[PDB]
């Protein structure tokens, strides 16, 4: 049974729902964006409209198969009414695709749903300036003071630096990036970039990277792994196991790998600057973790949350234990009490 905060209330509408059956009282099922735990459940059999952003619904069509009919793709930052009531799709600044979704209850409330997102001053001149917001439902997964993490350009310098730097000195070293969902995509670019090469993939990840919109695509990626020297694996093959197999495979054309694996947050931050990372080594092989994240750092939500003055906040992570709900509550009321809304 879906629960609470998954429903939108004075509406037929339901947010990451597909998990529950059919849901009683739901007319229209919005997808925030393509991660597996919000998607849970979507098929080819599915026979209710979806609404998404376009990349979504690409994704949805070619990956999960669901039939183009019950598609209902909307563009960004545009008023558009479904089932009688008004909302806008917002840039959730998260992976491709992903969207915040405002609301425009017939009674007068105002709901934003931020999906999953990474809260950014820039979304302060969006839409959302032009009208007050009762109800937040918000992406809570870092609300601690202890995540912090460095700005995305930050880590993308550190990336390309380090790539550039080894491959220079051994023209020999192949470089691996690990994925497992979409999202992170700057990371593997980036360093293709600076290489001049295309990043080499599976048939299956070459499928899913199609469907992003992304500029100029055909001439950063591909399938021919024997072009490119920089290669995508699973996230899981990031070891030194998986590695050492890889450079197997490769028919010595290298001799050296330096690996990247785009965690969001781990305890290596409380204590280390992005500029002293260093990776673990055996032999030929190194892997970089690296803070790359796609949600919020704690401060970047508190901003957002004081900026907009919600009446009423409902988190969507982090919900399955008492000490995680009165943590996040003790810190929404901090932010209330030090704006003063
Ligand atoms: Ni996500």
């Known amino acids: ?130 009208q007050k917001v009762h109800m937040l439902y918000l992406d809570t997964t870092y609300c601690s003071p202890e995540y912090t993490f460095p700005s995305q350009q930050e880590v993308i310098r550190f990336a390309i630096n380090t790539a550039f730097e080894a491959v220079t000195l051994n023209p020999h070293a192949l470089v691996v990036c690990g994925t497992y969902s979409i999202g992170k995509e700057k990371v593997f670019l980036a360093i293709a970039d600076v290489l001049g090469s295309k990043v080499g993939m599976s048939q299956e990840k070459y499928k899913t990277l199609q469907c992003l919109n992304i500029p100029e695509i055909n001439s950063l990626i591909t399938t021919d792994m024997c072009s490119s020297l920089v290669h995508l694996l699973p996230m899981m093959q990031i070891n030194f196991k998986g590695l050492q197999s890889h450079l197997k495979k490769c028919g010595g054309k290298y001799n050296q790998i330096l690996a990247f694996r785009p965690t969001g947050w781990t305890h290596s931050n409380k204590f280390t600057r992005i500029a002293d990372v260093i990776p673990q080594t055996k032999g030929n092989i190194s892997i970089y973790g690296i ?51």
């Open 1 to 130: 049974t879906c629960p609470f905060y998954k429903k939108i209330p004075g509406t037929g509408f339901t947010v990451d729902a597909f998990q529950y059956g059919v849901v009683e009282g739901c007319t229209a099922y919005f997808l925030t964006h393509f991660h597996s735990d919000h998607y849970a459940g979507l098929s080819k059999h599915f026979t209710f409209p979806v609404y998404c952003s376009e990349i979504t619904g690409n994704l949805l069509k070619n990956k999960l198969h669901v039939q183009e009919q019950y598609i209902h793709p909307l563009p960004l930052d545009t008023e558009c009414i479904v089932n009688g009531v008004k909302v806008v799709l917002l840039d959730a600044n998260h992976c491709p695709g992903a969207v915040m979704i405002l609301f425009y209850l017939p009674n007068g409330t105002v709901i934003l749903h931020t999906g999953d997102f990474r809260a950014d001053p820039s979304m302060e001149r969006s839409l959302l300036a032009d």
């Open 291 to 341: 803070p790359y994240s796609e949600h919020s750092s704690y401060l970047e939500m508190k901003r957002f949350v004081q900026w907009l003055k919600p009446q009423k906040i409902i988190p969507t992570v982090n919900v399955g234990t008492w000490k995680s709900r009165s943590t996040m509550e003790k810190y929404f009321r901090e932010w209330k009490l030090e704006a003063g809304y």
